[PDB]
Each structure stands twice: as structure tokens, then as C-alpha cells.
């Protein structure tokens, strides 16, 4: 937010350049992994498919029921 | 009604503009006042003179240039954004067809009612060389408004560097009574009722005053009580000097 | 030689008011007048200048705005040659202008009589009204025209001169600050009728009448209690030393209540005697 150095008066906003973005944040678009790489978690993997993956596919099926799908 | 507060810088700069143009008695000067008219007290924070030409023998002869107004108003926008045109002033004691017709000309550039000001360049009589006048219709009727002189903190202090009780009020109060004696005489010869209606109304404002005689002596009673305290002021000076006198007699002894 | 600036009552109030907005904020203006070198110097009228992105600087002068003003200032006959500029800065011990340094060198090429004025107090004035100007001497003060022949010059004794941070060289090249104010015949009668100490006029018949006798609603009201106030003020200090010696370690204690209750009583008597002294002629 552009302001005066002396009078400290707001003049005009500035575009985003340095946001203090907290670098070293991992950003990866559609990584490559399969659930078969790490075994034995199928008990927890099923819980990850039921509460996350399946409601993530189509939200219109759960919307017609009036309920809200879990976000995490 | 409303109130008008004019800074001393506006009236000081308005008189010199009359000298800068070398205007004689056959012509008068007209100018514009700037300030904030939105509040109930009209204040003039800026002014500038205009090249106004007029014939004294003909009331139908006047010259007012509106082109200098549009340019000056745009130049003040880069100086102070809070200053707008609240009206226009003028010089000379007389109000004639020249000043009355131009009152609507400044109204185009002035949102509120333009404030009329009669500026006395010679400063003739009492105080207030400039009086505050507002335009209102029932024929043009100009009503007087209270005119007070007030400046900023540093403005009043800055003027003091440039220039660096009981009898005063009595002499000023007697001049007001003498002005009223000539007020009824000059008005009587003009008729031969509107002003006299307001005068006879405030004249009446010892059946009920029988008990009001004591209140005069009640204040005089406190005056002597105050003089008792006023005497104590010098009673300590009566003691204060003997504080020295005891030390004064101890001087020759040491010498 | 140097130049002695003579600012009248009209120019001093206008140049000051333009720079009274904000402590940190800086503005600028233009001075105009007609005079000659060799001492004398006058200022007719001034007006403020617009502020650019650089604030106060040499590029902040707008030749388009300045040319339009000189045409608008011609109507009243106040249009004259450019005699200098005046700026506004918070002020420091040396170089009161935080930006302008060599900008006067470009001003001296346009006009050798141009100066740069800076107002130190910025609504801090205690009544002294101390303003600072600047003039570029460049190479000088050795075997040349002698400036310090006029008034209050050849300063710099020890470390104390003016603000005391300038000493000898002042801002740059010892510009030999000289400032004086004057009042004409019109400025004398106008100011005394407007502002001298405090302006009570226009109320002149009610001046002390309305401020006191008509203000009695609550001003001096309950004078019997007002006299009781003077009793407690006197009884407090008079109780201190009744032996005329050193006991409570005091000196002016008997004189403290003396001057305070004296002016109050003087005002109590004058207002009371003038209550019926105005003689409004009530009759019946």
C-alpha cells in the first residue's frame, strides 16, 4: 500500500511483487504416484478414498441430498 | 440568520489593490472572496481584486470580465483544494445599478448565496471598514450580518510582531448614543416606519422596580467588601517595607 | 554588494500561511516585486505553487502555471519581475531545506536577485517570527564588493550565531541574512483596526459591558463565594511566616496572594460600578 514517508498518507495501492510469500513452499501440479508404491495402508487408504477422493469426484450427487461433503 | 468571519489578511490585501490600480473616486473596485460557506459562519480565506470599470455619472455603465474568474479558479485548484468561491466583494459606500446587476453574475460560479461586502477604503468612522451583507428577496433587500475578525494561531501572532479599561468602555459607549441621536434625525427628514417599528419595540424592554432599588445597593455593598480585600493588598506592603526597615537599621551599624 | 530584503505586512502573512499545512509536508511559492540592487529590496505580492512528485525542488517550478499567473496578476497591476521563491520546510540547524542544495545555482542564472526563503517554525512561532532565506555567493567574499556594510553582519563569533549551528559560513558561502519589515500608511491604519493585541471592537459599547455586566449569568456569580476564594488564598500563604524569619523556607509567599487577589478585586470593582454607570435610562 503506497503511503507517504513523511506525512504517512495513503496515496495509491501497488501491485503484488514481494508478498512475503514464505518461499521453499512445494508447488507441484499433478504429481506422479500410486497407492501401490506404499503398501499396508489400504486400511487407511480406504478411509482416504471414502472421506476425500469419492466426494471430490462429483459434488452434485451429494448436493441433491442436501448434505455437505467433508473438506478434509 | 448567519455569521461572517473575515481574516485580517483579506482586508489588508483588499485595500492595497485599490492603490495598485490607482482607482479614483469616480470608480470602484470589485473582487471575489473565497472560503467555506457550507457552515453557518461564513469565512473568507482568500480574495483577489478584479479589473472593474464603472462610470459614476451613469449607473448603467459597468465592466466585469468573467474570463479572469475561470482562469483564477483553475489556478487556485493547484494551490488549495478546500477553497471555493463563496461570493464577491466590492468597494465604495454606495450601492447602485452596477453592483446590483453583477450580484447574479457571480452566482453562476457560486453554489450558495454570494456574500456582499461594502469595503471602505478611507476607513470612515468607528470600526469595521467592511460590513457583511447578504442578498435576499421578499426588490433587492440586503440584510446586515454580524462581522467578526478572527484569524489563525500563527496569523494573530505574526501580526503582533509587525506592531511590536474603565474609561475605554465609557468613551466607546457614549459614541453609540450619539450615533443614535443622529439616526432618528436623519431618518425623520427622509420620510417627510419599518425601522421605527423595531425601535419602539425595544424601548419598553417603579411598581415592579420598587424591590429593584435594593439590588443597586447590594452590589455597592460587595464593593466595600472588595475594598476591604483591596486594602489588604497594601496592608502587606505596609508590612513588607518594615521587613526591609529592620535590615536597613542594621546597615549603618555594620559600617 | 548584498541585498536587504524588506517584506511588508502583506507579503509576510501570505508567505507564512501557504506553508502552515502540516509539519512534514513541504510547499513552495513565488515572490514578485520591482526594486534595484545595492541594498533596497521589496516584495509586492506572492502566491503558492503546485507541489510535484519531488516536492520542493528546481523541477517543481511550472513554467506553464507561472506564465498563466503573471497574466492573471496583470489585471491589478501587481505583475512584476521574479524576485525569488519561498519554500516550506520543518527546519534544521544547517541547510533547512532537505532537498534544495544547488537549485539556487540554477535560480541565479535566471535572476541574480532571486532568493530561496524557508519558514523554520511551521506554526511553531512564539512571537519572534524567524524566517530563513538563501542567496548563492559562488566565488566571493575576497577582494570584491563588500557586503557587510549594511546591517547586522560579520557574525559568527565563537560557535554561537543565530541558531548557533551555522556560525560563520551560514548555509552556503555566507549569504549574510538580512531581513526587515515595514508598514506603509495603509498598512498602519488597517492592522491597528484589525489586529493589534486582541480585537474587541464592533462591540465597543458592549465591549466591557456585555463581556462583564451582561455576562454575570455565570462569571463572577456568587460574589460572596468569590470573596471566599480570596480568603483561602490569603489565609494559606499568610499563615506561613508570621515571625518574619526562616521557618517554612519561603520568600515571595506573602507576595503570591498579593498580586493574585489584587487584579481580581480591581476587576470586581470596575464591573460593579459600571453596572449602573452605563445609565440605560430605565426610569419606570
From Swiss-Prot, chain A:
Phosphotyrosine modified-residue sites: 35
Posttranslational modification: N-acetylated by NAT1.
Q: Where in the cell is it found?
A: Cytoplasm; Nucleus
Per the entry, what this protein does is: The 26S proteasome is involved in the ATP-dependent degradation of ubiquitinated proteins. The regulatory (or ATPase) complex confers ATP dependency and substrate specificity to the 26S complex.
The family annotation for this protein states:
Belongs to the AAA ATPase family.
The protein's name in its UniProt record: 26S proteasome regulatory subunit 6A
Q: What species does this protein belong to?
A: Saccharomyces cerevisiae (strain ATCC 204508 / S288c)
What range of the parent protein does this fragment cover? 146 to 217 of 434
Curated annotation (Swiss-Prot), chain B:
PROSITE patterns (UniProt xref): MPN
Keyword set, alphabetical order: Acetylation, Phosphoprotein, Proteasome
Report any Pfam family annotated for this entry: MitMem_reg
Gene3D superfamilies the UniProt entry points to: Cytidine Deaminase, domain 2
Q: Which GO terms describe its molecular function?
A: metallopeptidase activity
In its record, the post-translational modification comment is: N-acetylated by NAT1.
Q: Which residues form the MPN domain?
A: 4-138
Q: Which CDD domains match?
A: MPN_RPN7_8
Extract the InterPro entries matched here: EIF3F/CSN6-like_C, JAMM/MPN+_dom, MPN, MPN_RPN7_8
**GO annotation (BP), single:** proteasome-mediated ubiquitin-dependent protein catabolic process
Q: Which GO terms describe its cellular component?
A: proteasome complex; proteasome regulatory particle, lid subcomplex; proteasome storage granule
Any idea what job this protein has? Acts as a regulatory subunit of the 26S proteasome which is involved in the ATP-dependent degradation of ubiquitinated proteins.
Family indicated by similarity: Belongs to the peptidase M67A family.
What protein am I looking at? 26S proteasome regulatory subunit RPN8
* Annotated organism of origin: Saccharomyces cerevisiae (strain ATCC 204508 / S288c)
Record gene name: RPN8
From Swiss-Prot, chain C:
Q: Which residues form a coiled coil?
A: none
* One cellular component term from this protein's GO annotations in UniProt: cytosol
List the keywords (alphabetical): Acetylation, Hydrolase, Metal-binding, Metalloprotease, Protease, Proteasome, Thiol protease, Ubl conjugation pathway, Zinc
Q: Which residues form the MPN domain?
A: 5-140
Enzyme Commission number(s): 3.4.19.12
User: Which reaction is recorded as catalysed by this protein?
Assistant: Thiol-dependent hydrolysis of ester, thioester, amide, peptide and isopeptide bonds formed by the C-terminal Gly of ubiquitin (a 76-residue protein attached to proteins as an intracellular targeting signal)
The short motif JAMM motif is annotated over: 87-100
Q: What else is known?
A: Present with 16400 molecules/cell in log phase SD medium.
Protein name per UniProt? Ubiquitin carboxyl-terminal hydrolase RPN11
